[PDB]
């Protein structure tokens, strides 16, 4: 069986479809009992962000720019494509509500409660100027070294 | 022995080649390949002589008119210019004698690649089994996962 | 004793700098990287102190002339806004110095990074081995399944 499995996704887009697929395939695999590690970089750092407990202390012009005008959390995110201005997430989220797809925000929230463990790409922390207290409290600060330990302690690997 | 599973995730014509010009060579190699589709990636399987609109809500019925009707129309990840930049790969794959996509799909088929539907998204976007090419079986998440753990090639495309 | 392959489909200059940083430290680790670079991914591998347009077809120079002549020009994923928007990702990790796409290329190539240019892509789009970085090798999808296969993490970007 797969209880003893170990999946490392490294989460690079910031793209609502591409964030809802991996935690669709996160929860999936901790309700298999796999253990699931999700590095966001660059884009997909947008993910973990808490809207609640957002800042823009001491932080450059450039970095309270991004924070401001990025998206403030993860249900806020861009379709890849379709978008449409904001509309064609507006027909996908929609069919989803048909099928009582759940979305993206609450697909975190699952995530989070079968403990997931997210990380947050140490240099995309430090280019965009997030502080550790603008992400969910359990996200850990991981380098890319780390992110290689446990890429190749794992079963299965992939870029999204 | 060796086995490969690509998840492919894009709807883009140009990742689609990738994909199965991959799986194609592999299957040459006698590599067994599984190529689940998911989301977009499910407008590959479209049977453009087998499309159908009843018994869907309003929302899926727009959805299956209006997006690419099988493989040889999904729109280039880059430089499309409305069908035109596409138009130009294709007139640079054709001076080299490189496979279309819809060529390259149906050697995968011929050579049993074995082509997998995301369940959730089959359901989401509202196609019929009947819609997609008769070999295609729906598979869900956690089939997916155990295929991609058994295999020793696992891409997310 | 540790191997890694990815597959650079992206021609993006954010994807390709994830892709970079990832080789590099993993070369520091004594990993061994083979970078496959197959479509946009191509254009990571342009030495701009070489071009030529000789023997080529219309499209081809069209091509080659049009698009970016080296790793630093290549565009962002998203938001690249004329330029201006990766003048904006620019200017931040410039504050951060942290290092450019073309320093990291450098690095790579330094610590002997394998990077292969996959051969349908190279006939389809035009490129000569001489345009490419002289250590490049070309490389057919066979060969890099091959690869991959051996390897302990594979990823597609
Ligand atoms: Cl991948
Ligand atoms: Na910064
Ligand atoms: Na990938
Ligand atoms: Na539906
Ligand atoms: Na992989
Ligand atoms: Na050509």
């Given at each position: 069986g797969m209880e003893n499995k170990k999946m490392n996704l490294l989460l690079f887009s910031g793209d609502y479809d591409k964030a809802l697929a991996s935690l669709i395939i996160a929860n999936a695999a901790r309700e298999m009992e796999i253990e699931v590690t999700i590095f966001c970089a660059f884009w997909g750092l947008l993910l973990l962000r808490d809207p609640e407990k957002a800042s823009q202390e001491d932080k450059s012009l450039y970095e309270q720019a991004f924070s401001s005008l990025?998206?403030?959390?993860?249900?806020?995110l861009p379709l890849s494509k379709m978008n449409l201005g904001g509309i064609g997430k507006k027909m996908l989220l929609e069919m989803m509500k048909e099928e009582k797809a759940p979305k993206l925000s609450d697909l975190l929230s699952g995530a989070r409660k079968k403990e997931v463990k997210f990380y947050a790409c140490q240099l995309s922390v430090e280019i965009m100027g997030f502080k550790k207290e603008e992400l969910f409290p359990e996200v850990q600060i991981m380098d890319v070294k780390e992110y290689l330990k446990n890429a190749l302690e794992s079963d299965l690997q992939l870029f999204i």
């Open positions: 990025t998206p403030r959390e993860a249900e806020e």
